[PDB]
Structure formats: C-alpha cells, structure tokens
Structure 1
Amino acid sequence: MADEEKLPPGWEKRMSADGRVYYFNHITNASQWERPSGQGEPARVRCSHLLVKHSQSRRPSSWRQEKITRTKEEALELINGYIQKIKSGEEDFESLASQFSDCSSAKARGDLGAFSRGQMQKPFEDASFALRTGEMSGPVFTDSGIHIILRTE
C-alpha cells in the first residue's frame, strides 16, 4: 500500500493465450485481468463454497445425487462453468451453491462458518487463508472433489 505494489501472497504475473497480461494466484488458483494490488495471514476466516463431486471423491454421493458418476474431468468442466457464470454477472455465488453444491452446506447457501488452520483439508485451507475478504478462488482440488471458495469474513 505504501511506496510499494508488490503482488499479494500467491499472486504472479502471467501471459494469456490471447496475448494480454493477467494475474494468477498459485494457492487459490484464481485468474483475473485486474492487478491484485497497487505480514502474516488472518488468524481465522469465514468461507462459503460450492463443491462438485466426482466418481473418485472420498464420498461419491450427495443430497442431490445418491450415486455420483461424473468423471473428474466433467466435474472441472462444471466448476469452470460456474466460475464463468459468476464472473459474468448472470449468476451469483450463493444461488449456485444452494442449487448445485454437492456439499450439505448447500442448505446454508454454501456457508461453512468460521474456521482456523488444521480444521479443513489442506488444499482448501491453503486457498481459504490466501483469499482476501470478498475474493473467490479458482478450482481447488481436495479428496472431497473440486471446490470454488468465497471468503466472506
């Protein structure tokens, strides 16, 4: 913020397939055209998430499908679709989570409440603590499936 515009933790400058610089966070897997900026992590964060399970999930079943049979590839395709829909403005995170998340948290519009380190699967935890308030992750893979994470607090 002061006299410096170093990129925040996990952020790096990359070149898009179509020729424009963009920014990628290697911890949250988020990609955006906007420069992310221009100190330790938070002690606790509150996040909501949208989970898309697949046949190789630890528990290949959910409230919206007793037997999950989609491949991991298909799951990623859906995740990328939801991310694109949210970024476009045609859909909002909460609505999509309540309708399509394979996690029971869908009942709470994806809200998982607040948590500390050591309470969620590592990849999910790493992404969550690297997000700033209001930020959304890119595709995050865990033994549960593929997630889209939104930090609310």
Structure 2
Amino acid sequence: LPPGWEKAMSRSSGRVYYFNHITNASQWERPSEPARVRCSHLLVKHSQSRRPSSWRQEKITRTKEEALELINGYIQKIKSGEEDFESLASQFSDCSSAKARGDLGAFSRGQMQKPFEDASFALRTGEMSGPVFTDSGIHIILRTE
C-alpha cells in the first residue's frame, strides 16, 4: 500500500475505495521517492488567499467554500474526460502559469510550499491530486514527470 493510501467504504454504494490523505486523491481501483518531479497545477484563489488577485480578476472575492466547489467541478470534468486538465488550467487557473497550461517545471523538495510539495512527491507519474490547500488558495496538481 503506497505512501499515504488507505482503504475506505463509499457512502453511496458501500463499495470499497482508496483514498490518499496526502494528495486527497480518491479512486475505486487499488493503487500501484524521486529526487525531482515535474508538475502542472490549476489554482483557484479565494478571499483569504495571501494575494487575492490574479490575471483573471483584480479583486478575488469568492469564499474559500466557493473556491472548493469550483475545484470539485473541475476535477469532475477532468475525470469524466469532458475537459482536459491543461485546457481548464489555461482558462481558469488564478496564476500566471495558466499561460503554460499550468506547467511549473521540475523541482526538488525544499522549493515549494509544504502541502504542495508533499502532494507532488506522493503522486505517481501521470496521477492527479484532489484539492490541495496552500496559503495561495486551492490547487489541483498533475504530476507529469
């Protein structure tokens, strides 16, 4: 059982699923440290973000709860295949990295904010996180390398 993964019972169906408390990822299928990882992300900011401002909106007023609902809806569309991660990041991420389809490049430990770093290094290549909270706001993280 890879780092951070636990077994749980779905409320709706009673079927077993798997949850990762470090990445906040969840999935039905049973799952499965590098010096560097490469990640893309989609950031949704809220009124308590350290800098409640982005290229999308000079004053970001949405509540943290409203930001989480936006993040949840993006995760739904990405997982259904209705939308691609990069397309949503390019359009909706509250971050200049949107112009790069969310790409942050490669980094090692000791460079990024702790919740973001821990989730990034707990992901497998190609895997996506659930909502990850930092002082900047709420992130969806995609490990690409």
What's the TM-score, normalizing by structure 2? 0.98
**Partners of 1:21 and 1:102 in 2: CA distance:** 35
Partner residue in 2 for 1:14? 8
What residue in structure 2 maps to residue 3 of structure 1? none
Other structure's SS at 1:85 match? helix
Per-residue deviation, residues 87-118 of structure 1 (Å, max 9, x unmatched): 00100000000000001100000000000111
Structure 1 residue ranges, 4+ long, deviating more than 6 angstroms after superposition: none
SS in 2 for 1:106: helix
Identity %: 98
Cα displacement (A) at 1:30: 0.2
The structure number with the bigger radius of gyration is: 1
The Cα RMSD (Å) is: 0.6
Deviations 1:13-49 (A, max 9, x none): 1111431111000100001111112xxx110000000
- How many Å separate the matches in 2 of 1:18 and 1:74? 27
Find the partner of 1:117 among 83, 104, 109.
109
C-alpha distance in 2, partners of 1:35/1:121? 29
Work out the CA distance in 1 between the residues paired with 2:133 and 2:100: 22
Q: Aligned partners of 1:118 and 1:65: how far apart in 2?
A: 30
5+ residue gaps, structure 1, are: 1-6
Q: Is residue 28 from structure 1 mapped to residue 48 from structure 2 by the alignment?
A: no
Q: Distance in 2 between matches of 1:58 and 1:42?
A: 30
Residues in 2 aligned to 1:81 and 1:70: alpha-carbon distance in whole angstroms: 15
**Matches of 1:14 and 1:92, distance apart in 2:** 28
